[PDB]
Amino acid sequence: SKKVCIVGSGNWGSAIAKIVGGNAAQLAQFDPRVTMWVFEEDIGGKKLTEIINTQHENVKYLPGHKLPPNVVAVPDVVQAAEDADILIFVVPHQFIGKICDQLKGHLKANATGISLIKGVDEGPNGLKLISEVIGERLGIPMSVLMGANIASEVADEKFCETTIGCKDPAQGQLLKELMQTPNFRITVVQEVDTVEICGALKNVVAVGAGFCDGLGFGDNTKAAVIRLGLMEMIAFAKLFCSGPVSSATFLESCGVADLITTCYGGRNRKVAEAFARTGKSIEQLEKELLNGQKLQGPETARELYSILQHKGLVDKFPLFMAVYKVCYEGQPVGEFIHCLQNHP
Amino acid sequence: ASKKVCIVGSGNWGSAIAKIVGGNAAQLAQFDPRVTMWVFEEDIGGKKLTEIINTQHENVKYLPGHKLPPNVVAVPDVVQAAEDADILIFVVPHQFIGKICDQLKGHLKANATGISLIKGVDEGPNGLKLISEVIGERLGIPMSVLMGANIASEVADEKFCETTIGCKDPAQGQLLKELMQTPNFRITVVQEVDTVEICGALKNVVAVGAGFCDGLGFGDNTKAAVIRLGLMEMIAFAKLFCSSATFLESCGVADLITTCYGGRNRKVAEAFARTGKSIEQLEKELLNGQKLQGPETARELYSILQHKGLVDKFPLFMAVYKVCYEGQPVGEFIHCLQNHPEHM
Numbered sequence: 001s002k003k004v005c006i007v008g009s010g011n012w013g014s015a016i017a018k019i020v021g022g023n024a025a026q027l028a029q030f031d032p033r034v035t036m037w038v039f040e041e042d043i044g045g046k047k048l049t050e051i052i053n054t055q056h057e058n059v060k061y062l063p064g065h066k067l068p069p070n071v072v073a074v075p076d077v078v079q080a081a082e083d084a085d086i087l088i089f090v091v092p093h094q095f096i097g098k099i100c101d102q103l104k105g106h107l108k109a110n111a112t113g114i115s116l117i118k119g120v121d122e123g124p125n126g127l128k129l130i131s132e133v134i135g136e137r138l139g140i141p142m143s144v145l146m147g148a149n150i151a152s153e154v155a156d157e158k159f160c161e162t163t164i165g166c167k168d169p170a171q172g173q174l175l176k177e178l179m180q181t182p183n184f185r186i187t188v189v190q191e192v193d194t195v196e197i198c199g200a201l202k203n204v205v206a207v208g209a210g211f212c213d214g215l216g217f218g219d220n221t222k223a224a225v226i227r228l229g230l231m232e233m234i235a236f237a238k239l240f241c242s243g244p245v246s247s248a249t250f251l252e253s254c255g256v257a258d259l260i261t262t263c264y265g266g267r268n269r270k271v272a273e274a275f276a277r278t279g280k281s282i283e284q285l286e287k288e289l290l291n292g293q294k295l296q297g298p299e300t301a302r303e304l305y306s307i308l309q310h311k312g313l314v315d316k317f318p319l320f321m322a323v324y325k326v327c328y329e330g331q332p333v334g335e336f337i338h339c340l341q342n343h344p
Numbered sequence: 345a346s347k348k349v350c351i352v353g354s355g356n357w358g359s360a361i362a363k364i365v366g367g368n369a370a371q372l373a374q375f376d377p378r379v380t381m382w383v384f385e386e387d388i389g390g391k392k393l394t395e396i397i398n399t400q401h402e403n404v405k406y407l408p409g410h411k412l413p414p415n416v417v418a419v420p421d422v423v424q425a426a427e428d429a430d431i432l433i434f435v436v437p438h439q440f441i442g443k444i445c446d447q448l449k450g451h452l453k454a455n456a457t458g459i460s461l462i463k464g465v466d467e468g469p470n471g472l473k474l475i476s477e478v479i480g481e482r483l484g485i486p487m488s489v490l491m492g493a494n495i496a497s498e499v500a501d502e503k504f505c506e507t508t509i510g511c512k513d514p515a516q517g518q519l520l521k522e523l524m525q526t527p528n529f530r531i532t533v534v535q536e537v538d539t540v541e542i543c544g545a546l547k548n549v550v551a552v553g554a555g556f557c558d559g560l561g562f563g564d565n566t567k568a569a570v571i572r573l574g575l576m577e578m579i580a581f582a583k584l585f586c587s588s589a590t591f592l593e594s595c596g597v598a599d600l601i602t603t604c605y606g607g608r609n610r611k612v613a614e615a616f617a618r619t620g621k622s623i624e625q626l627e628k629e630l631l632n633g634q635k636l637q638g639p640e641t642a643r644e645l646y647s648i649l650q651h652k653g654l655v656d657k658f659p660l661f662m663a664v665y666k667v668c669y670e671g672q673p674v675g676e677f678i679h680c681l682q683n684h685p686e687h688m
């Protein structure tokens with residue numbers, strides 16, 4: 001039976017722990033002992049790992065939810081992963097570099113991985129998919145899980161779906177059995193890069209959606225911004241992804257559904273509304289409303305402008321490039337509409 | 345020669361369209377500035393609605409707070425309203441269009457053309473019959489459609505949005521584009537009329553489902569999954585009762601989004617789930633004469649799918665039908681999504 005290690009214990013990692021723990025305790029093909037690597041913290045005199053292993057509640061990152069008793073918190077990441085056939089990577093992108101340094105050399109020979117990390121790394125073609133970063137560093141085949149999946153709602157067992165991107169078909173099916181429940185439904189698609197690139201690009205669209213909200217517009221306008229954005233994400237994937245790219249993938253939960261949710265609510269939408277209404281800078285708004293964190297939407301747009309410059313294709317992505325110019329070239333946020341309005 | 349336009353209908357969307365078409369017809373030489381609008385007569389405060397429109401230039405009941413262009417003239421007799429028209433815009437709730445076509449049969453100018461804005465379906469010998477086919481066969485005019493993410497109140501406020509014109513004749517499509525398009529109302533002409541019209545009709549069924557989930561307290565993950573799964577069933581329905589690309593137009597994805605977030609079907613479905621009052625009672629109390637289109641479309645869909653022996657393949661469509669018409673408890677709606685063919 002296959003052993004599972006959840007690498008990460010935050011909001012989403014704990015929500016995922018509820019699903020994986022519950023399936024591993026019921027399904028014969030998985031070992032019921034699911035390890036979860038927990039970055040140790042002092043929670044009013046008690047180690048967070050001890051809290052998880054005695055109270056079965058991540059009181060800091062998923063308070064109010066019982067974790068399945070078979071999920072074991074492990075404060076050392078090598079000890080968490082050394083024995084696992086399946087590694088679920090679910091940490092903030094900032095920390096995956098360090099985690100992978102500690103793990104290289106210490107994994108089982110046929111270990112496989114699935115990344116839940118939404119975002120994008122750096123490399124030769126400008127961007128590099130995070131799952132390729134992990135896989136190359138650690139030498140393991142990689143899958144991805146991406147969808148319209150807010151962690152608090154998943155923890156509450158409110159119905160939702162998600163996309164598993166996995167090249168190997170038996171692996172995709174194995175991962176579906178691990179993570180699917182009556183209220184967390186899974187589609188397995190044999191693409192990885194197309195599933196994964198939506199998670200980065202959607203935040204660029206969501207900044208533009210926020211500008212439109214900040215300008216007084218409503219649902220019809222947001223719907224056009226999502227529609228044109230989706231078209232630019234499809235075209236961009238076809239330019240950027242190594243392999244074949246079909247439009248249909250973008251209608252999976254990783255594409256259109258996660259795009260809809262992010263454009264109706266989220267950090268990128270909220271800050272971009274504030275930017276359009278208060279004229280304050282993104283850096284200022286990050287400090288005043290995100291406690292100094294980098295908003296990924298504007299940063300990805302700037303990265304897209306560099307790629308398109310390398311390819312000679314800036315003029316074919318007006319919505320992406322309008323987000324870029326409003327965030328970083330001082331274009332007035334009213335001209336963002338002028339671009340929706342003189343589009344093709 | 346210039347073309348004369350008749351708007352057949354005067355509701356929430358009817359009146360918003362009269363604002364657009366009235367303004368374009370007054371500024372463009374190829375359209376006679378005199379646009380007639382057939383207004384089903386109503387006694388309002390001792391006065392005729394047609395006379396309120398022709399004196400006050402506003403449809404105070406169905407589009408309050410907006411002035412209609414004074415060149416738009418309300419007309420109570422539909423034959424008189426259409427008699428001299430080259431272009432007829434059909435925009436009435438789908439339950440009335442049959443009767444109106446019987447009153448107009450035989451009385452139209454020799455080479456008249458039509459465009460249907462009506463979001464519904466009908467039934468015929470091939471199972472599905474499109475409303476544009478009903479109109480066109482019964483009146484003997486060629487038919488186009490206009491469908492998109494077009495909440496009428498926002499269009500009337502000149503908030504930016506898009507729509508899709510479906511038209512087989514490219515010259516005719518260009519003419520209708522000129523008639524309808526404004527700097528805040530952008531039009532794409534495509535030739536796949538049937539698919540455009542099906543999208544418009546079926547999205548209101550999905551929106552009833554969406555409203556049910558809002559009313560039971562599911563959040564955005566569930567709404568996004570209802571939207572996405574609704575889109576999959578829409579695509580499967582088109583493939584059977586009619587290509588992917590049309591669903592990326594405004595009439596597909598965009599309209600599904602705007603409707604499941606801000607339409608009248610969604611709002612009444614939510615109240616139904618929260619209050620247990622009936623659709624019919626809620627329609628009368630909350631929409632002040634405006635008409636739901638989704639529940640009836642859901643009934644007709646079930647009948648169409650029954651005759652192709654395909655009911656069981658469309659569980660979301662059928663879940664909406666059975667809650668609205670067969671007394672299935674709205675608490676059970678979601679269970680219809682937990683075994684959907686998309687995740688099999």
Ligand SMILES: NC(=O)c1ccc[n+]([C@@H]2O[C@H](COP(=O)([O-])OP(=O)(O)OC[C@H]3O[C@@H](n4cnc5c(N)ncnc54)[C@H](O)[C@@H]3O)[C@@H](O)[C@H]2O)c1
Binds near residue numbers: 095
């Ligand atoms: N939270 C959601 O609703 C949600 C939903 C879908 C996807 N995601 C994605 O999952 C990934 C993680 O999201 P999250 O909600 O768990 O974030 P989170 O901020 O709640 O994660 C808490 C994490 O902090 C990590 N951490 C803190 N300090 C650390 C340190 N010095 N070294 C190593 N790790 C440290 C811990 O490993 C812990 O996993 C993100 O990429 C996000 O894109 C989140």
Ligand SMILES: NC(=O)c1ccc[n+]([C@@H]2O[C@H](COP(=O)([O-])OP(=O)(O)OC[C@H]3O[C@@H](n4cnc5c(N)ncnc54)[C@H](O)[C@@H]3O)[C@@H](O)[C@H]2O)c1
Binds near residue numbers: 353383406
């Ligand atoms: N309202 C919107 O936001 C919107 C947007 C796009 C498309 N549509 C679609 O437009 C079509 C018409 O919708 P609407 O908003 O203009 O109408 P509506 O929902 O406002 O209904 C009001 C109209 O119903 C008419 N009516 C009532 N009883 C009648 C009767 N016995 N006989 C004839 N007419 C009667 C009235 O003349 C009134 O004008 C529908 O298919 C709708 O799905 C609506």
Ligand SMILES: [Ca+2]
Binds near residue numbers: 438464465466467644
């Ligand atoms: Ca009908």
